[PDB]
Design a protein around this ligand. Structure first.
Ligand SMILES: C/C=C/CC/C=C/CC/C=C/CCCCCCC(=O)OC[C@H](COP(=O)(O)OCCN)OC(=O)CCCCCCC/C=C/C/C=C\CCC
Ligand SMILES: C/C=C/CC/C=C/CC/C=C/CCCCCCC(=O)OC[C@H](COP(=O)(O)OCCN)OC(=O)CCCCCCC/C=C/C/C=C\CCC
Ligand SMILES: Cc1nc(-c2ccccc2Cl)n(NC(=O)c2ccc3c(c2C)OCCO3)c1C(C)C
Ligand SMILES: Cc1nc(-c2ccccc2Cl)n(NC(=O)c2ccc3c(c2C)OCCO3)c1C(C)C
Lengths: 242, 220, 242, 220
C-alpha cells in the first residue's frame, strides 16, 4: 500500500547509525585461515558485520515490514542477508569495470583485487560476481530504481521455510512485482522482456550466494548459531538512520 | 492484449504435447528410477526448439546443470494435497519411507516444503512446460555461447509472458503470476546445490552412484 | 650487538596476536567526515589501529629496544608509527604497479583505488606515496633485507625530542647504519651510491607522513591525547607474535 | 681508500670558499634579515655546479623548497654551546627575546633542539657545505626533470661519501658519519613544514609577510 519504488529509493539514501557491532562474521578459535591472514580476514568480517547491521536497519523501516510478525522479520533477514551483501557488492563494483574485471568493491574506498581472490582460493566466485552480476547489470543498464526494487524482492521471500505468515509475506512481494513491472513499462517502456531480464539475476545471485556459504563455512567464519539472535536484537535496539 | 502469434501457440502446443509423453536395497531403487526420468528430461530437452542452434559441449553444460533442478520440478509436480506427499505413481522410491530406508530422510522435509510451495502457485501444464524449458535454457557457468542460450531462453520467456497476459486480459496481476514463476528458478537453485552436496557426501562415505549419475552430476 | 638485518628479517615473519584493539585512529563525535562515509572511514581506522598494534609489538622484540628506558620506548614508537604504516603501505603497494599507479594496498587483500583517494581529496598524497616510495623502491630494486633495516632506522630516531637517553638510541641507530652499509657492500656490491640511495627515501617518507597528519587531524581522526598511553599499555600487556 | 679525484677536491674547495662569502617592530626585523640570507642562499645555489643543467621552472621549484630548510641549517650552524643559544652575530632577530616580542616564541624550543642535535654531530665546513648542496638538489614535488636533479645530487652525495671515507681511512664508522648526515635531510623536512604552517597562520591572522617571502613560500 505504502510500499513503492519511490519510497525504497529515498530509504536507500538514509544512513545507518554507528553500527552497533554484531558478530555475524568473525575469525574464531582454531581456524584453518593461516596465521598471517587472520588480521586481514578479520577486518573484512568486521566490514561485512557493519554492512549487515545497516541491512537489518534497512529492512526494518521498509513499509509494512515491521508490521510483520517478529519471527518472520527475523527469518527473512536471516535468509537473505548474504545475497543482499553480494548484490550490493556487485552494484558497487560496476564503477570499477573495464582480461576479466580485476576490482571488486566491498565498500566505498575499498576494493578487493582479483589476485587476492586467487590466493584466497576464491577466484571463481569472485569472477561470477563481477560478470553474472556486475557486468550483466551494466550491460542491462539497470538503474537505481530497479536496484532497490530487486533488493525488496530478494528480502521479501515468502518461500522462506519456517515463516508463520506466508500470506503476509506474499502480499508484500507481489506488490513489489506490481511495482517493478509498472516502473519498466512506464519508463524503460521500449525495452521488451525487461521485467524477466531483471528478475533473471535473482537465481544467479542465489547460486553465487550459496557458493559463498560454502567458503565461509569451510573457514569457520559464520556464527550460524547466533545469527537469528543478532537480528532479533538489532531490530529492537539499533538506532534509526539519518 | 497482444494475442499469441501462431508461432507461439504452436510452441505451447508442442511442449504440452511432449510433456505428457514423458511423465514417468532402497537407495538401489531411487538411483535407477532417477536415471529413467533423467533420460526423459534429456529427451524433452533435445526436442526443444533451439537446442540444436547450440554447441555440443554447451548442450552437455545445460543438460548436466538442469538435470537435478528439473528433477525437483517433476517430483514436485506430482504432490497430492490431500495426503500431503508425493504420489509419483509411487514406485515407493520417492516416499518418506524409502528415503528413510535409504538413509537420506532428512532431505524429505526440504523437498516437501518446495512441493507445498510450488503446489500453491496453481500452474497450468503450459506454465509448467514453459518453465521446464526456461530452466533448461538458463545461463549456466561454462557456456561457450551464453549470448546464444540467452537468445533461445528469451523466446520461451516471452511466450510464457504473452500466454499469461492473454490468460488474464492484460490484468496487472500478470506481472505477479509471471513474477512468481520466475521466482521458482531461484528456489530451484538451492535444491540443485543440496543435490550436489549429497553427491559429495556419498563420495566421502563411499556410496554407489551408477556411472550415469556419477558422470552427469560430476565427481571430481 | 644482537641487532642485525638477519634477526630483523626473521622477526618480520612473526605474527601479531589477535590485535588487542587500541583506538589510535577513529572517527569520533562531531566529525567533518560526511555521514555516508563514516562507516568506511571508520573501518579503515579499524585497520590502521590493527597495524599499529602489530607495529608496537614488533618494536618491542627488537634487539635491545626493550632494554631502553620505558619513557623512550614510548616516544620512539609515538614518533614513528605513522611513517612506518606509510612505508609498509608503499612496500605492500609495489605488487600492484603498472597513467599513474591506480592501486594502493593498505593490507593483504585490500586496496585503495586512486579514485577513492580523489573523492577523498587526498589525491596528491596518494600519488606521492606510490611514486616517491613504491615506484622508486621498485626501480631501486630494494629487497626485504634493506626494507627491514630501514624500518629499524626509522624507528630508532635519536633526534626524537623528549628522550631521556639519546646516547642509547644513537648506539642502536648507528649499529643499524653499520649493518645496512655492510649488507650493501657484501651483496649489492656493484651498486655504488646505494647506501645513500636507500636512505634518501627517509626524508621522502617524512614529508608524506607529515602531509598525512595534515589530513588525519583535519578530519579529527587522531586521538593524539591518548597515543602515548596506548603505546604504554600495548608494550606491557599485548601478547608476543608467532 | 680511493682518494678524492682532482675533480671532487676542486668541488669541495669551491664550496668551502663560497660558503664563507655568504655567512650573514620585532617581526619587522626577522622578515628582513631572512630575506637577506634567503638571497645569499639563492646565490650560493645558482653558483652550484649543476644548477644550470636544470630547467628554469625546476630551479624555482628547488630554490622555493630548499629555502626554509637551508635557512634552518644556517641558523643552526651558529649555535653556541656555552650560552646554549644562537649567536647569529645577534641582530637580536634570531634570539629568544625578539621571537617573543614577535609573538612566535613557541617555535624557539623546536629550533634550539635541532641546534643542539645538529651541533652534536661535529660537522666540517666541508660536511656542512656538501650537505647544503645535497639539500638543494633533493627530489622535490613538481620537478619536470627529477631524473636530472637526482643526477646532480648524486655527484655531491658521492663526493661527501669519499671525503668521509678518506677522512676516516675507510673506517666502518664512515657509514655512521655519512648516515647521520643524510639523517639531517629528514629532520630538516619537519622544520620546513613547521615554517609553512606558520605562514599559513599569518594568513588567517593577517600578518605582513614581505612579497619576497610571500612569493618564495607561497600563499594560496
Ligand atoms: C597513515 C594512513 C594508514 C591507514 C589508514 C587510516 C584511516 C584513515 C582513512 C584514510 C583513507 C582515506 C581514503 C579512503 C576513503 C574512502 C572514503 C571516501 O571515498 O570518502 C569520500 C568522502 C567525501 O567527503 P566530502 O566531499 O565532504 O568531503 C571531501 C573533502 N576532501 O571523503 C571523506 O569523507 C574524507 C575522509 C578522510 C580520510 C582521511 C585521509 C587520511 C590520509 C592519510 C594518508 C594515507 C594515504 C591516503 C590513503 C588513501
Ligand atoms: C559475502 C561476503 C561479504 C563481505 C566479506 C566477508 C568477510 C570474509 C572474507 C572474504 C574476503 C576473501 C578474500 C580476501 C582475502 C584476503 C586475504 C588473503 O589474501 O588470504 C590468502 C590466504 C591463503 O591461505 P592459504 O594458502 O592456506 O590457504 C588457501 C586456501 N584457499 O587465504 C585465506 O586465508 C582464506 C581466507 C578465506 C576468506 C573467505 C572467503 C569467503 C568468500 C565469500 C564470498 C564473497 C566474494 C569473495 C570476496 C573476495
Ligand atoms: C539418485 C538421486 N535422485 C535424486 C532425486 C530424486 C527425486 C527428485 C530429484 C532428485 Cl535430484 N536424488 N536426490 C535426492 O535424493 C534429493 C531429493 C530432494 C531434495 C534433495 C536431495 C539431495 O536435497 C534437498 C532438497 O530436496 C539422488 C541422490 C542425490 C541421492
Ligand atoms: C620570515 C621568517 N624567517 C624565518 C626563519 C628564521 C631563521 C631560520 C629559519 C627561518 Cl625559516 N621564519 N621562520 C621562523 O620563524 C621559524 C624558525 C624556526 C622554526 C620554525 C619557524 C616557523 O618552526 C619550527 C622549527 O623551528 C619566518 C616566518 C615563518 C615567521
Amino acid at each position: 500500500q505504502e510500499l513503492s519504488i519511490e519510497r525504497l529509493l529515498e530509504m536507500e539514501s538514509l544512513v545507518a547509525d554507528p553500527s552497533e557491532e554484531f558478530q555475524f562474521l568473525r575469525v574464531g578459535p582454531d581456524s584453518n585461515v593461516p596465521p598471517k591472514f587472520r588480521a586481514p580476514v578479520s577486518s573484512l568480517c568486521q566490514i561485512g558485520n557493519k554492512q549487515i547491521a545497516a541491512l537489518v536497519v534497512w529492512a526494518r523501516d521498509i513499509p509494512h515490514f515491521s508490521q510483520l510478525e517478529m519471527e518472520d522479520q527475523i527469518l527473512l533477514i536471516k535468509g537473505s542477508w548474504n545475497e543482499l551483501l553480494l548484490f550490493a557488492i556487485a552494484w558497487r563494483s560496476m564503477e570499477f569495470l573495464t582480461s576479466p574485471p580485476q576490482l571488486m568493491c566491498l565498500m566505498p574506498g575499498m576494493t578487493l583485487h582479483r589476485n587476492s581472490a586467487l590466493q584466497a582460493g576464491v577466484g571463481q566466485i569472485f569472477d561470477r560476481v563481477l560478470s553474472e552480476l556486475s557486468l550483466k547489470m551494466r550491460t542491462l543498464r539497470v538503474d537505481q530504481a530497479e536496484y532497490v526494487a530487486l533488493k525488496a524482492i530478494i528480502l521479501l521471500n515468502p518461500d522462506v521455510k519456517g515463516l508463520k505468515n506466508r500470506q503476509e509475506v506474499e502480499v508484500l512481494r507481489e506488490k513489489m512485482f506490481l511495482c517493478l513491472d509498472e516502473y519498466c513499462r512506464r519508463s524503460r517502456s521500449s525495452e521488451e522482456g525487461r521485467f524477466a531480464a531483471l528478475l533473471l539475476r535473482l537465481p544467479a545471485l542465489r547460486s553465487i550466494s550459496l557458493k559463498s556459504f560454502e567458503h565461509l563455512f569451510f573457514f569457520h567464519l559464520v556464527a550460524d548459531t547466533s545469527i537469528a539472535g543478532y537480528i532479533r536484537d538489532a531490530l529492537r535496539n539499533h538506532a534509526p538512520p539519518i | 492484449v497482444p494475442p499469441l502469434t501462431a508461432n507461439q501457440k504452436s510452441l505451447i502446443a508442442r511442449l504440452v504435447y511432449y510433456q505428457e509423453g514423458y511423465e514417468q536395497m532402497p537407495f538401489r531403487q531411487i538411483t535407477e528410477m532417477t536415471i529413467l526420468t533423467v533420460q526423459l528430461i534429456v529427451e524433452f530437452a533435445k526436442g526443444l526448439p533451439g537446442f540444436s542452434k547450440i554447441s555440443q559441449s554447451d548442450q552437455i553444460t545445460l543438460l548436466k546443470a538442469c538435470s537435478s533442478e528439473v528433477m525437483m520440478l517433476r517430483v514436485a509436480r506430482r504432490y497430492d494435497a490431500a495426503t500431503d506427499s508425493v504420489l509419483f505413481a509411487n514406485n515407493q522410491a520417492y516416499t518418506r519411507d524409502n528415503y528413510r530406508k535409504a538413509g537420506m530422510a532428512y532431505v524429505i522435509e526440504d523437498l516437501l516444503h518446495f512441493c507445498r510451495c510450488m503446489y500453491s502457485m496453481m500452474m497450468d501444464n503450459v506454465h509448467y512446460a514453459l518453465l521446464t524449458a526456461i530452466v533448461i535454457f538458463s545461463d549456466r557457468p561454462g557456456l561457450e555461447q551464453p549470448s546464444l542460450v540467452e537468445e533461445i531462453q528469451r523466446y520461451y520467456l516471452n511466450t510464457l509472458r504473452v500466454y499469461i497476459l492473454n490468460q488474464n486480459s492484460a490484468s496487472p496481476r500478470s506481472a505477479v503470476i509471471f513474477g512468481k514463476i520466475l521466482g521458482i528458478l531461484t528456489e530451484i537453485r538451492t535444491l540443485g546445490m543440496q543435490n550436489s552436496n549429497m553427491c559429495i557426501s556419498l563420495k566421502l562415505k563411499n556410496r554407489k552412484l551408477p556411472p550415469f549419475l556419477e558422470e552427469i552430476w560430476d565427481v571430481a
